[PDB]
Structures are given as structure tokens and as C-alpha cells.
Design a protein around this nucleic acid. Sequence first.
DNA 1: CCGACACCGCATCAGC
DNA 2: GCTGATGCGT
DNA 3: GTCGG
Length: 327
Amino acid sequence: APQETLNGGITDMLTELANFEKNVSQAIHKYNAYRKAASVIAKYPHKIKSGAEAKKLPGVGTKIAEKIDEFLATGKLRKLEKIRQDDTSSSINFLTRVSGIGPSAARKFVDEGIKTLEDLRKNEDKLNHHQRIGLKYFGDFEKRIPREEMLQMQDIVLNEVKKVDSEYIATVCGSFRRGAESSGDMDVLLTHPSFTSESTKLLHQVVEQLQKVHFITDTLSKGETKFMGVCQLPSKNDEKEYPHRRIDIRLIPKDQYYCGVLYFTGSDIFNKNMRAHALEKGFTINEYTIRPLGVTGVAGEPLPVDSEKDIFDYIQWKYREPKDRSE
DNA sequence: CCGACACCGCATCAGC
DNA sequence: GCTGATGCGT
DNA sequence: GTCGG
Ligand code: NA
Ligand code: NA
Ligand code: NA
Ligand code: NA
């Protein structure tokens, strides 16, 4: 985990570029290209001396190598400096930081003169439900969640779920499950023996109880299988109130639950490699199932999975702890 | 050279 | 009103 | 923007 001081200037630059591609130029693939470049460089255990050196890293190509050369010789990048001062682009880029406001909404807003949160605040009528909530908790949503708070949050979630029906199975996934010391939000995977792929309010009852005890404070979206909202830990009489947090709850069929827990636990890298290894072993693993691949490439019916290990067993790969799934 | 870069639930829009 | 497409987010 | 069939 090389200190940012190594190539932080370079990594910051690529990430800033990444954001403008995504939020202003609406070029999602260039956005991911810059992210990938910044990721590989952020991991590089050496202070980069030239673009040629960086180009050796997978994800860093001709254009980025050239930009690195400019940054190393001048300490900046003309194209980035210019776009920072651009009132329109900087505003569009900024507005996307509000949950619910994507590249399209941000452009539409800036086009009609709405460029700041203050502007947004004065124009509630132009915001949909999600966006109003995103505006309401703008600061809180950008704050991270200490593991200690994630544990208290888990305590409430697991308690209320069991209270609704002791047969529910709930698992808080994400980096939190891998042992991370901080999380950006809470991702809860829920299932019930009564719910399977080929079988016929399970989610509603849980969301409702969480609201009843005033843990869940707002709802961004809610259907029969996925809830996205806001929650807040109860504050101690006198204590500063805790920040509002983003929490998602997904109801998944029992027979596909562990493939789900596996995937949403990550990391994104571990998923890539495991899915790779699975292929060569003659298996295709996605978010919902693991299936065998015949000699001509024809996928067969999904294999029974009753635990994460079952998945690991199928592809000959000793079960690895979540704490060791960094890659 | 030029297509891939993931799949999908929900809220909401666009077209009929 | 219904159906499909789009925006957004994870 | 980068990769690769
Ligand atoms: Na490269
Ligand atoms: Na946003
Ligand atoms: Na954003
Ligand atoms: Na019971």
C-alpha cells in the first residue's frame, strides 16, 4: 500500500480526468479507463519518473503516458487546468455528487442556471424524490462509516429481522464482511426458506419493522426484491446525532443466496479471479448461480448451493475467508 | 481497424 | 391506460 | 482511453 506521496499527483490527476469523462463528456468507458490507470499506478511501489515507465503497466496507454510526461515536467496538465476553471463543466461535475443526480440531470440543471446546492435548495419543485433526499443528506452521504458504527447498525438489522421471522437469514456484505475498518454504506442480503427461484411481502415486512423502530428514516426506492434507503443509529440523549447512512436491502431466492453473498462480498478483484478460475474448471459463476460448461460450451442447469463453500468445492479452491478475499 | 468495456431493479420518462 | 426505453445506482 | 481479436 504505497503512500500517496509516491505518485499521488499522477493518481489525483487521472481520477479528476476520470470524473469529467463520466460526468461532463458522458464517456463512461473513458471514465473507467482513467480509473483503471489510476488504480494500477496507485499500487505501483515506485515513484514514476516518466510516461514510458508508466506505460509498462496494464491500463496505461499512449495518451496517459503523454499526460504523465506533461505533469512530471510542469506539475500540471493544461487540459485539466482549463476545465477546472470552466464554470459550466465544474458545475455539472459537482452536481453529480448529489445522489440521484447523474450526468443527464446535472447537465439539464446547469443548462437552466442551477449550478449550486443553494440553487438546488431553491428549486425543490425541479427535483424528484431521490434527488431531494440526496440533497437533504449531501454531507452525511459523503462521510464514511466507522466499523464500530457498522457493528451497531448490524446489531439492529439482525435483531429486527429475526424479530419479524426467526427463519429469515440476513448477511451484511461488502467490504465490511471482509473486515474493512470503514464502509461507505450498508449492504444487506436477505433470504427466507419460503422463497426460491421456482416458487412464489417478505422484503416489505422487514423494511417496515426497521421503520417502526425508527432505524430506517427515508426510502429512495423499494420494490419486491430491492430496497434502497437511509438509516440512522439512535443518538444518546445529549450526544451529537449520528450521520444518516445509506442502506440497501436485497431479497434473494434461497437457492441463489450464497452466490449472492459471495458476489456482494467481493472484492471486485477476487470476483474476477474466482470467476476466471471457475471457467477453466468447466464452470460459469455469476451473481445468481454456478453452472457446468459442456465440451462445446453449452451451460447446464445451475448446481445446488447451500453455502459459500459449496461454490468453492465445485471449482476446486479451498474456502477462503472473507478477510482474505482482497484479491 | 474497430468492438468491448456487466447485468439488472426501480423510478420515471417517451411513445403510443 | 400500457409497454418499452432511459437515467441512476449498486 | 486501452486493450486485443
Ligand atoms: Na500499458
Ligand atoms: Na449523483
Ligand atoms: Na456521484
Ligand atoms: Na419463529
